[PDB]
Design a protein around this ligand. Structure first.
Ligand SMILES: Nc1ncnc2c1ncn2[C@@H]1O[C@H](COP(=O)(O)O)[C@@H](O)[C@H]1O
Ligand SMILES: Nc1ncnc2c1ncn2[C@@H]1O[C@H](COP(=O)(O)O)[C@@H](O)[C@H]1O
Ligand SMILES: Nc1ncnc2c1ncn2[C@@H]1O[C@H](COP(=O)(O)O)[C@@H](O)[C@H]1O
Ligand SMILES: Nc1ncnc2c1ncn2[C@@H]1O[C@H](COP(=O)(O)O)[C@@H](O)[C@H]1O
Lengths: 424, 424, 424, 424
């Protein structure tokens, strides 16, 4: 462990974002796009979190694997992540599956997508391969995980963090020892084992595996020949590494970038619809759990050119009132009440509206005299005049999609089967 | 006139924006910046108008002449106008006066700045040279002025537009004939001559001269040797061309880009302080005279990455009310009243403020319980708590600078002198 | 026909490059890449021809359709064609077929690829849709084809140019009248009909169709419902437009950009292997048919950062001799004879080589004492020591691929079945 | 010393490259350009060395101080060093002296340039300030000098390296102790003191001072008020820090990046004309002292788009012979002999030339039947037909400039004076 080691491992490293793959539990949010390209934060996409942590961690060589509905994703990487110069060892390579006969190849698993592209990744000559799930929201520093991987003399290093046992049936539960060496790993159990001394919580894998380059190539080619295998990192390989005792665990609180050290680390995978809504409006509160006014760990995105947020008087000459809300650029709010809401770019709300705990994805047009409560308005939805959402549960659940918790989702297809011409 | 002559006139052409110039009528606004680099519109600088008209007119070769306090200007061109490629015949040159032998070189006049850089401009190999004053705000199409210049068989074409005879003592008044050939030109008269049939208005030069390049080079070298010359385009050259009868006039309403054809063309040179303030708030009204939500003639600028505009509750849990205002990105408005105002980037207003007909240039901090009206807050001004501006004119004259019209201007040096340290 | 019309139609236009789709007659040159991504010119790819003609024709909105082996292509557009800003109406959108169920969708035809993406192209709001085959090499101005399309009052406008009847069985042969109105169109005939008064030549379609936006959308939806249709522009639609008499013909000599007006227009589709090799060395001769030292119609590409071309002495201290050859950057030629050749980037040739009428695609390593005549060395081929190519026809045809005209092609797979470790 | 201290020392840091400076020992080379902007290496400028070491050392915040003839320099930074984003904490500022009141401001010395811009540098909020002379050619790692500065608890760390006592009268000679603390510093002595145990060599300052920022600001404001000071870092400040015992020395062989560890570190300041010529041709030899085919420490520059280097046959159909030369892109060499030479971009050599130990800066045209040896041809020089250089020293002294060592220098003004018009 030398003094100039913390700086030379990111440069000998290469990150691989398994962007591609939809989130099925997000219903129609991700019907026309990949989960990493779901909008978030007023101006971000989820994959801006798993990319700006590579940059600020020094890892300037990324590999974005994209399968399902990637036009918007690729078009976002193109416009916001193509400032690189390949001559200074940095790049964001897109690795969709390469078709030679109209659908002959198609990425059978998570770990069968790093094996199709294993002739391109060898050419990078990397020693440490970070394996990032980029449909997640976090502010980690992977040059403090890579060290903890190099100090321990590990082959694979799984970033683990504890979560409530109630939600630990959707993640990879493990069990460690005094030396943070994984002893028992099981993927997506039906009865998540608890931690020792913490019966109400389980030590879960985040989908962030650091691998020596030599061991990963030798483990996938040793796994690609397995017909029985399901070709996934959690469900096939990490048990294989674990059962040889070459798998260590890296606590996330160590390599988490927070502005308040007294707080707990922030991890939201935006699993269902409810946690997507809840995760945006936790940017609109007074004290957000996620700091985005931070200049020591900024998040890079498509810096679209939009005019200032305009607030104008309604048809009656009256004021427009706002409370704990975000209004991004392009918006035009004509004298209506906006509360606990998040308006993204280009949202044009007309007069006399009432908007409460809403999330208005971009290019939404809200017509005159609309009332919106606890809803998610999808991209380009042209809400008609006098529409009421979030006051009649037996109404909203027979028009739009309504989650068990009360969250409504509105899409153009939902609003075009109702008869509202939404071709504006 | 060939049918394919409109599209290859902007490629044989080269624009020269005379960015340098104090614009002394602005008093303290331009103390630390050049007149072009004054902030405008929530996110623009005035030189984004004289540059985005060259782009959308096809003129991709520009030459920005900068002398006085150009650090902010040059830093703006570097970060928002350096997307060009030199192998596609397009660039944004910066031609500030070349310095050797302990600060020897400085331009004697407007036209003694286009001469020193006459060895670099000949390299461009440009047939037509557009000469743009870039301290002006307008939406023109120079590929309709170049045609009118090539149809007429003109050598130099002055863009002229009528203005009230009261303000015509600041511009170049001319007189034309039936075939738009300048007969009488006089620069900055003390008694501006009126138009025929319009006694209340004068036909003024805008500062926009299109030149046959073979004539410009021969005219400046024939002028640079003149010992009594003032080395100015209006004060020396344009009378010389006029007196030979080689000077035509191009009406601006023809080559103006406006979304409402029933309206009059828009020209504001932001002369004094009052017309700066009035010009911004004319973006905050309901029907702006200047359209900036126009996609057929967009304005290019520094697309700074800023978070959404955040509105939060005050100390007391209460709402914040807005009326005909622009709130750009980065702003944080803690539950205060904002009316007829324009907040630029990064403006952090604290609780219980009242803001009326104000313009808050970037990085301004308004403290708790401040009242601001009919004022212009300079960049990074840290307004202290309980400050009151625009209610006692006799008490705003001594503390700050107050125009004759009632407009107040606040700078850090004005506030630092009263002992309100501005170190944030 | 107004005077400012030549400049306003490219802005109301959108180009669609049918890049996607391999060139089967190129054998193994396009086995790991799409034909638009075939290298050409020492530093270009074929799709830099059908893109730089959109830029210099003012068409800044392109749509690159990519299906077969597009990793290289996409990775080229990302690194050399992503300098655009979407806020000044300009972009290069990549439109690969969007998969929702692992190969469910896959682009059944050339005109069934503009129909899958017909919800994205409507959003561009474009009046004139240029349909460009981008597997071709030419220097055309599409703002002189668009006019000739607007003057004639046409619906569709097929760029046609005469070719020898011998090769006219691979293109779309048509037949026109006095008003350049197509009368008889047949796609890929077995007996190409000749021209009137030129029995030895046929009037052939280039794959460059300009279409009013309103007619194209109504023609593909009216064609997508046809089960009998083969979904192709030539084989299905252009006969349908022709049989209604709405199809005009635009001669290519009019809208061709040449630097010698006495010459004939340059069109090479790089059909077979022989014409690819012939087409590059026609850059190496003394008077190229294709001018690439032209600054009035430059070609934009991935401006890779490479050191100067180094020529060094061989093991014996001797000179290296060159004759009518192109040596791009990165190359290291150790004192060998290079004749009528084209070396791309990074080509390291070792001592005592002899290279004649060769094309060395990038990262090729030629070992010591090699002789190469009339060959095409593919990307990254590690030629071993003492290899001899192009002197024994019955030898080179049993090792590598040898066309009927004598041209040899060398790939890594060909040189790894022969036992030469080529993993360098 | 923390294990994560090497990687967050380049982020709390800010580099200041003093680009301005005539470098008068170069005579006519730097007549029209600054010493930093002198061309080097076939494609680089000297300031690409002092900048790519900040990038690859993690220092992404640079401050380029430019005074003398900076148009080419600024135009280079604009086109090759303006890929940075201000929201990711990285930029390349240009801090030329601010001008108001008819050319008033000009820096009195090296250290009176970092003071005027002391209101802009405090905004950076930098703990460590690297002070780089950028008129020098070396491959250093400043994140190994910053650590050595933070281990030692030093305030200011001077990078020192030994040089022959013959040339030690041009640099800052010092004397150190066991713990590398400067005891005696004297700037540009007339009798450079020797090292202990190495009588033939002196321990010289490179011009590379690392500073505690809290100490720099307090040292320049405490120096700017000095009436007898010369306002220089070596001549005024570094003796002041030395005499307090707060000045440590950092050996350059530790923080040098070299591909052959058995070699000595590479430092060439290109002092006179002879060491400029010798320094370039040391790129053309077989084993360069400076490695530029190194991918672990690449040099970033203006990646100009140029065609491949073309070699063609002469008038007579004959070959062109090369020996240990560099031919960059754009060159066209018509069958002539080139030996031990360095041709930059766009050099068009005509037939029957003989070129030996020459350096042809860009856009040079060599005419037919020219003989050139041991000379330096200035940018855009149009050598006429049958010119002979470097065979008659008595006839090259009068026509051009000839050093005492035998090196010739050719400029356009030297050739224009002999009546060889240089207008191409
Ligand atoms: N203004 C719009 N109207 C309708 N659909 C859109 C609009 N903008 C984007 N889309 C589509 O909405 C889907 C999701 O895109 P995005 O919201 O950008 O991920 C894609 O099918 C887009 O092509
Ligand atoms: N946050 C800030 N605080 C104080 N001065 C600033 C700040 N930002 C820019 N300036 C200075 O304000 C002046 C005008 O800059 P600008 O408003 O950008 O034209 C220049 O002297 C800048 O360096
Ligand atoms: N240095 C290399 N060695 C082996 N294969 C390569 C190399 N560079 C690119 N390739 C591959 O060669 C194929 C063609 O790429 P390209 O020649 O860039 O179109 C692709 O499969 C690339 O991944
Ligand atoms: N083709 C050219 N012909 C004559 N002068 C040039 C040319 N290119 C650049 N220069 C001038 O040469 C001087 C040095 O420029 P540079 O060699 O780029 O540092 C400056 O005065 C440039 O404007």
């Amino acid at each position: 462990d030398h003094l100039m080691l913390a700086r030379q491992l990111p440069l000998k490293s290469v990150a691989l974002i398994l962007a591609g793959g939809r989130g099925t539990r997000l219903k129609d949010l991700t019907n026309k796009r990949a989960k990493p390209a779901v909008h978030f934060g007023g101006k971000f996409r989820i994959i801006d979190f798993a990319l700006s942590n590579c940059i600020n961690s020094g890892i300037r060589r990324m590999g974005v694997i994209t399968q399902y509905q990637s036009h918007t994703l690729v078009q976002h990487i193109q416009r916001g992540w193509s400032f690189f110069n390949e001559e200074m060892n940095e790049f964001v390579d897109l690795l969709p599956a390469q078709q030679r006969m109209k659908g002959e190849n198609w990425y059978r698993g998570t770990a069968d997508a790093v094996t199709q592209n294993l002739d391109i990744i060898r050419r990078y000559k990397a020693e440490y391969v970070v394996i990032l799930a980029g449909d997640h929201i976090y502010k980690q520093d992977y040059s403090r995980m890579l060290i903890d991987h190099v100090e321990k003399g590990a082959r694979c290093t799984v970033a683990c963090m504890p979560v409530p046992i109630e939600e630990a049936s959707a993640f990879g539960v493990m069990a460690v020892d005094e030396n943070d060496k994984i002893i028992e790993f099981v993927e997506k159990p039906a009865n998540p084992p608890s931690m020792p001394n913490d019966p109400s919580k389980s030590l879960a894998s985040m989908g962030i595996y650091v691998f020596d380059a030599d061991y990963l190539y030798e483990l996938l080619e040793e796994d690609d020949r397995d017909e029985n295998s399901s070709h996934d990192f959690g469900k096939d390989l990490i048990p294989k590494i674990t059962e040889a005792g070459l798998a260590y665990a890296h606590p996330f609180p160590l390599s988490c970038v927070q502005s308040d050290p007294d707080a707990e680390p922030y991890w939201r995978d935006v699993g269902t619809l409810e946690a997507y809504w809840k995760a945006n409006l936790d940017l609109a509160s007074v004290v957000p759990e996620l700091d985005m006014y931070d200049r020591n760990w900024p998040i890079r995105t498509y810096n679209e050119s939009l005019p200032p947020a305009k607030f104008v008087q309604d048809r009656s000459g009256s004021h427009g009132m706002t409370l704990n809300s975000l209004v991004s650029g392009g918006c035009v709010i004509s004298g209506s009440v906006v509360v606990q809401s998040v308006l993204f770019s280009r949202v044009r709300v007309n007069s006399f509206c009432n908007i409460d705990s809403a999330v208005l994805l971009p290019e939404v047009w809200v017509g005159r005299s609309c009332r919106l409560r606890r809803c998610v308005i999808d991209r380009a939805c042209v809400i008609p005049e006098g529409m009421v959402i979030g006051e009649n549960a037996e109404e909203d659940a027979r028009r739009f999609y309504r989650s068990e918790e009360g969250i409504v989702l509105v899409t153009r297809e939902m609003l075009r089967k109702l008869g509202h011409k939404q071709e504006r």
